[PDB]
Design a protein around this ligand. Structure first.
Ligand SMILES: Nc1ncnc2c1ncn2[C@@H]1O[C@H](COP(=O)(O)OP(=O)(O)O)[C@@H](O)[C@H]1O
Ligand code: ALF
Ligand SMILES: [Mg+2]
Length: 418
């Protein structure tokens, strides 16, 4: 009972199916992610792999991080070390077989990584050809969130790679903001992508202080930039609770690798919950009842048997007793690692890093500061609801755009239709 595809959305699929290594791109909430799900529905599913930048925005479209797939850790070391690792039992085949590769949020891949892959691709598989032959279906938003700075100098976007133009000949554009309803909020947020604050932008978003966004016993609360802010916030907000502490330690195929799980995963070693605690759903469960990836709920009890499993009411409204599930990661080695743990993370505080790839309903964000170019746009363009959104301490030097990029979406603009 699925909805209609845009004439554009459709044309991408038509093009991908033929068998073209295409890339696609457009604003926050224009069905980049979703189109991938319907492409993954249409693609012969043997040797067809799916991936993303963030370990979360994969648990979202049911793949793994480009990292864990490729099996070369950080990609720091040279072309000869990197092909050592790809050659290893497990990874070797992972490669040989992939006929089709899909990557969401390409923004947070940094070109020297892309390049170091392309080479390794041609390497193990032995094709004398672009990316070892493999059909690249990519997407992301460049003006959204850019790659994590390794050292000090500026980190280097993916479109700036030398392989990039050689590996993804074609590029096409998505154009309508399906996410957000209200047409003011469409231009309001189309502005901030391009990096403009004239005073109605600034007035309206300032307006939202007096908004009270927090809904049914449940807040999709603050989007901080820094991760230690996030985890710390909650460590208080949960202490600030009368009930007793229910501990949930995991059960990993390897104990001593837990850290690799930790950072590639979406869950903690030790997750701790009391009554009334707020939480989020990190894997999909039942897309019918609507326990999807990114559910906002509140801990309404535990049972007194089993492992005392949590009970949760959600925003979508339906109530389910949560069991533990199982994640696996191709841990640079050719070992697959397991973890058994609840698919819940404490949903008071969430980094802007995590929130990219996702949609939201019920958000807060402080903007009395300056933020890394893009970092502003992202956290705003999460919310569906302009009414159920609250900005704090707004400041127009928050709104920053990298112009290397703006000129990338000018060079494309200036040889096209409108
Ligand atoms: N063809 C469509 N028409 C209307 N809404 C759509 C369509 N495809 C997806 N959506 C909705 O639009 C929103 C944005 O999708 P998403 O894939 O998260 O975009 P992006 O990856 O650009 O952030 C989702 O809430 C989804 O429900
Ligand atoms: F472009 Al997105 F969530 F993938 F806004
Ligand atoms: Mg997405």
């Amino acid at each position: 009972s699925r909805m209609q595809l845009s004439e554009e959305q459709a044309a991408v699929l038509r093009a991908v199916l033929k068998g073209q290594s295409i890339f696609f791109t457009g604003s926050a909430g224009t069905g980049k992610s979703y189109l991938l799900k319907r492409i993954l529905g249409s693609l012969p599913p043997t040797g067809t792999v799916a991936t993303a930048s963030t370990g979360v925005a994969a648990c979202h479209i049911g793949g793994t991080t480009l990292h864990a797939f490729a099996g070369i850790g950080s990609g720091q070391a040279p072309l000869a070390q990197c092909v050592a690792l790809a050659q290893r039992p497990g990874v070797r085949q992972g490669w040989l077989n992939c006929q089709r590769l899909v990557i969401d949020e390409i923004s947070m891949v940094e070109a020297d990584l892309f390049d170091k892959l392309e080479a390794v691709a041609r390497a193990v598989r032995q094709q004398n050809k672009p990316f070892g032959g493999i059909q690249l279906i990519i997407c992301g938003d460049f003006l959204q969130l850019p790659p994590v700075t390794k050292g000090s100098q500026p980190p280097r976007f993916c479109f700036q790679s030398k392989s990039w133009k050689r590996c993804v000949p074609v590029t096409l554009e998505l154009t309508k903001v399906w996410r957000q309803a209200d047409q003011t909020f469409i231009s309001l947020l189309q502005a901030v992508r391009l990096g403009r604050c004239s005073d109605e932008v600034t007035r309206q978003l300032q307006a939202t202080a007096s908004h009270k966004v927090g809904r049914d016993g449940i807040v999709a609360t603050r989007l901080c930039t820094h991760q230690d802010d996030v985890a710390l916030t909650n460590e208080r907000r949960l202490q600030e609770l009368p009930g007793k502490v229910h501990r949930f330690e995991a059960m990993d195929s390897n104990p001593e690798l837990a850290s690799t799980l930790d950072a590639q995963c979406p869950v903690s070693q030790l997750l701790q919950l009391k009554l009334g605690a707020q939480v989020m759903l990190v894997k999909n469960l039942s897309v019918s009842r609507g326990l999807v990836n990114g559910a906002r709920g509140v801990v309404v009890g535990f049972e007194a048997e089993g492992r005392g499993l949590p009970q949760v009411r959600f925003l979508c409204g339906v109530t389910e007793v949560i069991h533990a599930d199982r994640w696996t990661v191709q841990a640079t080695g050719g070992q697959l690692l397991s973890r058994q743990q609840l698919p819940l993370q404490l949903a008071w505080a969430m980094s802007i890093h995590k929130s990219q790839g996702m949609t939201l309903d019920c958000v807060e964000i402080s903007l009395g500061r300056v933020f890394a170019s893009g970092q502003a746009y992202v956290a705003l363009s999460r919310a569906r609801s302009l009414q159920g959104l609250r900005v704090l301490d707004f400041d127009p030097m928050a709104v920053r755009c990298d112009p290397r990029v703006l000129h990338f979406y000018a060079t494309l603009r200036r040889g096209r239709s409108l």
